């Protein structure tokens, strides 16, 4: 818990959402920070619970590809103070910067696989791995954020189940509510598709049950324009229907690493 | 014939046998495929002949419980098929001893549906065994491996005769080299026994002539542990010695469909 | 017939004439070759005359003849060399591996039998390994094309590999090669041991006429020893052809891998 | 474990992918400095510490503002880039250099190390007549109970047993050396241009090889093809390869 008097805030908001507001600021520990400010004095219990849960996960994680938490500030509203990733959500960035080269997209998504490989070996499932939850420190350095749905796996266990982002969820999540690192790997495939699609939403114009039927038939989203075949192959591997034949992040990270070194 | 440049292949092989290798891949049309890759650049003429005959039969077939062929590609000869990612049924059941009897019934019924289609299409498989059933999922089986399959002639009830899987052949196949859909029904009975035995090989430790002699005496493989009596009866019905009193696949399918509905 | 200036040879000999590793130029690329270098020449030319007519993955392909400082037979290289030597040096090649190789030999011999040629020197030393999983047949110095009006050729003598009708009547057919193939299998499962060790040619002939045969090599599967004995069927008409021999090995290998 | 205060660095980078010219302390040694995945630099240094040969880049040490690997300077830089910029180096000159590489590799072979990245880009020129081997990031010492090391993959330089079985020996380095020779006689051209890694593997399994570069003596192209012997046991070691280059250079000169 942090001292509101050591925190200063820029007036203009970086962005907004259903939870409230994100602002740039500075905190004396002076670090440049991104501050998630809950709307309406955090009257909404689901907003407080999410802030508490994502803060409790972040406190346990330490990895260069995961956003670091500074702390919580209970002031005029509840505030989650994190290290600033200046450029913001990856999907919004690619929508506004169509010039980013395919090699650059591989570098970024590979870094996300490194943060997810770290999460995998830490026994955490993210359960909300989408391009909007990747934040850019620079155009060549991405970090994973938004741990509000993240869970630590139990030693005797798949996590068995608020928000339900069905277009990123694997078949065993939809049908059995079972979440694993392999479930995150499927979401990572969707995220790769978003990135090579420069921030297009997946399964545009489809309802939840329409996506589920589509996947059960073995159909998948198509290859984004300009996406190299090896990357589209990797997306299809992440979209392996069966949980045991789906690769883990150790394998996914290794394939992205090896492929990047070949591009340059 | 396919374009090798549109085919990509995963490095680690899914399996291997005397023909060569089976790999996972992707082919642009982009479909996830299983690729049978002949060994030693397809130098062996019997392997090439089997792939050609395999592809020629599959091309004529279209059924949800039969593996679909994408095509053939010639660094080696490759048979590109739609992926059933869980692989051979016998190997799966050996690895998953927990599969429920109701689940076995579901899978074997799906096999009978593909065979009823094959029977109606005037094709004999002649290699119907558990290793030639491939699992799309644990609840969806397809028949593969049509290298011995034949189209029956319009002027014949059976095909009269490479590999000789004696343990799956009916008495008329052994004694008179006569193959019919009724002959495939006998093999289906051995397949059911394999599946309820969780992938055990049939007639463990017997020679061909010992199996033939045991069958002529009216003896049969025993009831696998945990197998419902009605299913073992159906096995024994499929193992009806006389060709005319053995049921065809229309009757075998309906029986499995009705016992499954009951369970 | 080949251009000596397009050929280069390594100094060290592979074996013994002399066999050398070398390289032959065809366009921008070089083909790795084995060269048989003569220490008559009519026998090399007859050997080349046979090989020119053959084209099969399980037969050594001839590049050509080079009349240079010495008479030379230029063949595609099978890097690993004679099969008998290889098994003497690699005592732990698996029986499944041996079956694979002898089956390849039988596929090479079925092609020869279908082309109306008799090899007449079919032995393990005349099987060359491209890899440990790929054998080719070499050494056609005694080979003959059967005339269209004859089912056998009537005539150095590798008697220990020869069928009784060769020894007693000078008749050589594809069935006669099948008998030699049986000796070759015995060599292969004996890891390059010589057949009938310590026996003169006259003593092998008498033992064969009596009905006696070489014993089962230690560790040899019984189905393969049976197949040797079938190849050693005394009567030529009851001895299998190579079509039947290849199918037998094909099915048994399938059994062993499964 | 070097003193940063004794090190000075030139402002402009020699190359990136960052490599800089610098000086390390009455006399100061001219150094090249690789300036940065941290564990992999320390492993690279752990290998270079054990080596001492005139045909291998000597490490001065590690300096912990960034992580730095400080090596003796080989002023002319990577061999492939050099030959791309100096198209008229004589084939006698090229043989001298690749033979020097074979002398460094024979030392590595005798020291039971496998380089695992032997390529023309990882040969640095002290002068046009003196080459050294660099870049030990993938290098491994062989265990005394093993003939090979069993495992970033420069697959176009890798032998089939590396690709097929993940096995790396000095013979595997001999294969890469054949590719390095092709690069050298092709004046820094990349091997198998326009081919995917999977396409190279299939070609090699087929028995096909890269062609003879223009102006390449036949005896050197033969030596490439010997280094590309598929079977590991019949592939020459570096003792034989070094001797072939030594005698052929004598013949040329
Ligand atoms: C699901 O929707 C959202 C929820 N989430 C919120 C969030 C941001 N966090 C963070 C941490 C460290 N640095 C940053 N930097 C940063 C820089 C420029 C930005 C944004 C964020 C920005 C936004 O956030 C708008 C609200 C979208 C817009 N611009 C231009 N953000 N932390 C969390 C939990 C991100 C996600 O996209
Ligand atoms: C030994 O005999 C074999 C010959 N035959 C080969 C074959 C596979 N085909 C196919 C078609 C579509 N999808 C598949 N998928 C699939 C998925 C995982 C698998 C296998 C196959 C797999 C194997 O195949 C090994 C060789 C057993 C192992 N794993 C783990 N296979 N098609 C044919 C003609 C099957 C039979 O069992
Ligand atoms: C004594 O009887 C001989 C006569 N014959 C000669 C011959 C070899 N030929 C050939 C063709 C293509 N590739 C090869 N490759 C090859 C590779 C490594 C080898 C040998 C051959 C090798 C030998 O040859 C020694 C002499 C045994 C030794 N090493 C180590 N050899 N072709 C013919 C007509 C083989 C038979 O064993
Ligand atoms: C994969 O690409 C690279 C990685 N590697 C890096 C490396 C260089 N090292 C070294 C040691 C001692 N002296 C030198 N001298 C030297 C002199 C002029 C040079 C270079 C190096 C130079 C470069 O290095 C650019 C990056 C290519 C450019 N110019 C013009 N370099 N050490 C290592 C580990 C070399 C390889 O080519």
User: Which residues of chain B make contact with D198, given a CB cutoff of 8 A?
Assistant: 8-9
Fill in the DSSP letter of residue B186. H
- For residues D23 and D7, the answer to whether their CB atoms sit within 8 Å is yes
User: Which residues of chain B make contact with A237, given a CB cutoff of 8 A?
Assistant: 10
**Does any CB of chain C come closer than 8 Å to the CB of residue B18?**
yes
Query: What residue spans of A128-248 are helical by DSSP H?
Result: 171-176, 181-196, 208-216, 229-238
The residue written with tokens 């083909």 in the block is C31
CA D246 to mean position of chain CA atoms: 18
What is the full DSSP assignment across A136-181? Answer: EEETTEEEE---TT-EEPPTT--EE-----GGG--HHHHHH-EE-H
Whole-Å CA distances, D188 to A60, A89, A240, C116, D116 = 50, 42, 42, 53, 19
The candidate with the shortest Cα–Cα distance to A193, out of A233, A139, A152, A161, is A233
Please count the other Cβ atoms lying within 10 Å of the Cβ belonging to residue B223: 17
Half-sphere exposure of D214 (CA within 13 A, CB side): 5
The residue written with tokens 């006698």 in the block is D92
DSSP-based three-state secondary structure for C210? helix
DSSP-based three-state secondary structure for A244? coil
Cα angle value A74/A80/A84 (rounded, 5°): 140
d(CA B175, CA B211): 13
The candidate with the shortest Cα–Cα distance to D146, out of D171, D160, D126, D167, is D167
Long-range contacts formed by A228-234: CB under 8 A, 24+ apart:
A228/A102, A229/B8, A229/B28, A230/A259, A230/B8, A231/A102, A231/A106, A231/A192, A231/A196, A231/A259, A232/A196, A232/B30, A233/B8, A233/B26, A234/A189, A234/A192, A234/A259
Half-sphere exposure of D86 (CA within 13 A, CB side): 16
Residue contact D205–B75, C-beta within 8 A: yes
d(CA D133, CA D125): 9
CATH architecture under which domain B84-263 falls: Orthogonal Bundle (1.10)
Neighbours of chain A (3+ CB pairs under 8 A): B, D
* Fold assignment, A85-264: Transferase(Phosphotransferase); domain 1 (1.10.510)
Residue contact D152–A264, C-beta within 8 A: no
Whole-Å CA distances, D249 to C161, D101, D119, D244 = 50, 13, 21, 9
Q: How remote is the CA of residue D204 from the centroid of ligand 4, in Å?
A: 30
Query: What residue spans of B101-180 are helical by DSSP H?
Result: 101-120, 171-176
**Does any CB of chain D come closer than 8 Å to the CB of residue B9?**
yes
> Does domain B1-83 correspond to CATH entry 3.30.200.20?
yes
**Residue C41: CB partners within 8 Å, gap ≥ 6?**
C71
Fill in the DSSP letter of residue C45. H
Residue contact C80–D225, C-beta within 8 A: no
Please provide residue C81's backbone torsions phi and psi, each rounded to the nearest 5 degrees.
80, -170
Fill in the DSSP letter of residue D143. P
- For residues D67 and D38, the answer to whether their CB atoms sit within 8 Å is yes
CA C153 to mean position of chain CA atoms: 18
Q: How remote is the CA of residue A37 from the centroid of ligand 1, in Å?
A: 11
CATH architecture under which domain C78-258 falls: Orthogonal Bundle (1.10)
Q: Which residues of A6-42 are buried (b: 16+ CB within 10 A; e: fewer)?
A: ebebeeeeeeeeebbbbbbbebeeeeebbbbbbbeeb
For residue A207, give both structure tokens.
């309802």
The candidate with the shortest Cα–Cα distance to C230, out of C166, C190, C195, C185, is C185
CATH label, C1-77, candidates 3.30.200.20, 1.10.420.10, 3.40.50.10860, 3.40.190.10: 3.30.200.20
d(CA C11, CA D199): 34
Q: How many residues does chain A have?
A: 264
d(CA B36, CA B24): 9
d(CA A111, CA A142): 6
CA B257 to mean position of chain CA atoms: 19
The candidate with the shortest Cα–Cα distance to D172, out of D193, D194, D153, D199, is D153
d(CA A61, CA D125): 46
Nearest CA in chain D to C27: D211
Q: Looking at the DSSP assignment, which residues form a beta bridge with residue C29? A: C26
For residue B150, give both structure tokens.
């034949």
The candidate with the shortest Cα–Cα distance to D177, out of D242, D246, D85, D86, is D242
Neighbours of chain C (3+ CB pairs under 8 A): B, D
User: Which residues of chain B make contact with C257, given a CB cutoff of 8 A?
Assistant: 17-18
The candidate with the shortest Cα–Cα distance to C249, out of C185, C162, C174, is C185
- CATH code, residues A1-84: 3.30.200.20
**Residue B97: CB partners within 8 Å, gap ≥ 6?**
B198
The candidate with the shortest Cα–Cα distance to A148, out of A235, A249, A69, is A69
d(CA A73, CA A59): 14
The residue written with tokens 């909007």 in the block is A132
Half-sphere exposure of B27 (CA within 13 A, CB side): 21
Lateral strand order in the sheet of A134-138: A88-89, A134-138, A141-144
* Rg over CA atoms, chain B: 18
- For residues A252 and A236, the answer to whether their CB atoms sit within 8 Å is no
d(CA C215, CA C213): 6
The residue written with tokens 């260069």 in the block is A64
For residue A226, give both structure tokens.
């300009």
Q: Report how far apart the first and last C-alpha atoms of chain C are (Å, whole number).
A: 48
- For residues C45 and C65, the answer to whether their CB atoms sit within 8 Å is yes
Helix, strand, coil shares of chain D, percent, nearest 5, are 40, 20, 40
DSSP-based three-state secondary structure for A71? strand
B175 is in an annotated binding site: no
- CATH code, residues D74-253: 1.10.510.10
Query: What residue spans of A61-180 are helical by DSSP H?
Result: 90-96, 102-121, 171-176
The candidate with the shortest Cα–Cα distance to B141, out of B111, B118, B97, is B111
Please count the other Cβ atoms lying within 10 Å of the Cβ belonging to residue B169: 23
Q: At A254, which helix (H) or strand (E)? A: helix A249-263
For residue B33, give both structure tokens.
């495929």
For residue D61, give both structure tokens.
């040490």
The candidate with the shortest Cα–Cα distance to C227, out of C63, C98, C78, is C98
- Please, do chains A and C touch (3+ CB pairs < 8 Å)? no
**Does any CB of chain D come closer than 8 Å to the CB of residue C5?**
no
Fill in the DSSP letter of residue D212. P
Chain gaps in chain B, named by the residue before each (C–N > 2.5 Å): 29, 74, 161
Of B10, B30, B86, the CB nearest to A232: B30
B22 is in an annotated binding site: yes
CA D73 to mean position of chain CA atoms: 16
Q: Which residues of B32-51 are buried (b: 16+ CB within 10 A; e: fewer)?
A: bbbbbbbbbbbbbebbeebb
Q: How was this structure determined?
A: X-ray
Q: How many residues does chain D have?
A: 253
d(CA C155, CA C168): 11
**For ligand 3, which residues put their CB under 6 angstroms from it?**
C 14-16, 19, 34, 36, 60, 75, 77-79, 81-82, 125-126, 128, 138-139
Cα angle value D172/D173/D174 (rounded, 5°): 90
Instruction: Output the residue whose Cα is nearest ligand 1's atom 25.
Output: A15
For residue A48, give both structure tokens.
């407080």
d(CA D69, CA B28): 46
Q: At C177, which helix (H) or strand (E)? A: helix C174-189
The candidate with the shortest Cα–Cα distance to B124, out of B37, B188, B70, B219, is B188
d(CA D101, CA D121): 12
User: Rounded to a whole number, what is the distance in Å from the CA of B85 to chain A's nearest CA?
Assistant: 8
d(CA D138, CA D153): 9
Torsional class of C143: left (φ above 0), alpha (ψ -120 to 50), beta (otherwise): beta
CATH label, D1-73, candidates 3.40.1010.10, 3.30.200.20, 1.10.10.10, 3.30.1780.10: 3.30.200.20
CA A61 to mean position of chain CA atoms: 14
**Residue A198: CB partners within 8 Å, gap ≥ 6?**
A94, A95, A98, A100, A224
For residue B142, give both structure tokens.
């397809």
For residue D138, give both structure tokens.
């993938």
* Domain boundaries defined on chain A: 1-84, 85-264
d(CA C251, CA B162): 7
d(CA C50, CA C44): 10
- Strand pairing report for C29-37 and C71-76: antiparallel
d(CA D170, CA B158): 62
d(CA A66, CA A71): 15
User: Rounded to a whole number, what is the distance in Å from the CA of A222 to chain D's nearest CA?
Assistant: 23
d(CA C118, CA D74): 65
d(CA C211, CA D241): 56
**Does any CB of chain D come closer than 8 Å to the CB of residue A262?**
yes
């Amino acid at each position: 818990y942090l001292d509101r008097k050591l925190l200063t805030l820029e007036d203009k908001e970086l962005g907004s959402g259903n939870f409230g507001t994100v602002k740039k600021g500075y905190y004396q520990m002076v670090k440049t920070v991104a501050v998630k400010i809950l709307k309406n004095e955090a009257n909404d219990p689901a907003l407080k619970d999410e802030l508490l849960a994502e803060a409790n996960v972040m406190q346990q994680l330490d990895n260069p590809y995961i956003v670091r938490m500074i702390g919580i500030c209970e002031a005029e509203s509840w505030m989650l103070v994190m290290e600033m990733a200046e450029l913001g959500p990856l999907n919004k960035y690619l929508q506004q910067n169509r010039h980013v080269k395919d090699k650059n997209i591989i570098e970024l998504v590979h870094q996300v696989s490194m943060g997810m490989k770290y999460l995998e070996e830490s026994n955490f499932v993210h359960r909300d791995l989408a391009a909007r939850n990747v934040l850019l420190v620079t155009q060549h350095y991405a970090k994973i954020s938004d741990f509000g749905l993240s869970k630590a796996l139990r030693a005797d266990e798949y996590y068995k189940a608020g928000k339900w982002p069905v277009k990123w969820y694997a078949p065993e999540c939809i049908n059995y509510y079972k979440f694993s690192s392999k479930s995150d790997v499927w979401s990572f495939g969707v995220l790769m598709w978003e990135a090579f699609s420069y921030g297009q939403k997946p399964y545009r114009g489809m309802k939840g049950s329409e996506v589920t039927a589509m996947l059960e038939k073995g159909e998948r989203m198509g290859c984004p324009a300009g996406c190299p075949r090896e990357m589209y192959d990797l997306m299809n591997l992440c979209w392996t229907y069966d949980v045991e034949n789906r690769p883990g992040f150790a394998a996914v990270e290794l394939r992205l690493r090896n492929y990047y070194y070949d591009v340059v």
